[PDB]
Design a protein around this ligand. Structure first.
Ligand code: CL
Ligand code: ZN
Ligand code: ZN
Lengths: 126, 129
């Protein structure tokens, strides 16, 4: 498993994360394992230790991707301070949404994960 | 659930954690939801970011507890410089050991966790008495 993401999209995510006091989250839209569009979604928990997508904004984003013939390649979110490795609650979310999970933090670290076996996904930056 | 822990036991755990450069781990032995004995167990990973109990010591601790008519109320361990919230590895362990998981850190924070009837992470109220 690999995740192919354009450099400028990953840098844009990292830049938002570097300025956020709460966990950030959103969708990686595209095709196969290739990211073609990034969509931030509001973290309705407003929290530095967990996230939950605003459901109305989530549905709107999914509708817009469908209109554009895009699929959900992944879910991305950030951690504050701690490493980009799934938490226990993250693993529960990966079972609900078994796509690629990209995790980043404010130190510029990034790793990707996919599902009862969890494996790291190699990130290919383009 | 609710976890009732004596104040001097929780203080002892937190002050050991404050002085430790690796994750600390052990058993909370007792009755029902009441901690009656704290037993530290070597972290065989000798790691600041994860833990695993030395099997040798783990077995002895459980037979000692049995000799005193005590049951496993919980497992406790520490995180260093991260919130006291279950890691992904912790969740795997919580499914193998469905008891209360008390997590602390070097900032003196402490939270407790169990898996619900749907096997989801759920927070447990801690009563310090
Ligand atoms: Cl263990
Ligand atoms: Zn996370
Ligand atoms: Zn842990």
């Amino acid at each position: 498993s690999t995740l192919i993401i354009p450099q400028h999209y990953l840098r844009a995510i990292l830049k938002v994360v570097s300025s956020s006091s709460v966990e950030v989250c959103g969708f990686l839209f595209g095709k196969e394992n290739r990211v073609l569009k990034v969509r931030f979604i509001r973290n309705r928990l407003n929290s530095p230790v967990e996230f939950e997508m605003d459901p109305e904004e989530m549905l709107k984003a999914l509708e817009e991707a469908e209109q554009e013939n895009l699929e959900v390649v992944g879910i991305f979110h950030s951690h504050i301070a701690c490493p980009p490795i799934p938490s226990g609650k993250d693993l529960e979310g990966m079972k609900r949404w078994p796509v690629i999970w990209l995790i980043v933090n404010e130190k510029g670290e990034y790793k990707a994960w996919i599902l009862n076996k969890i494996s790291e996904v190699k990130i290919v930056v383009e």
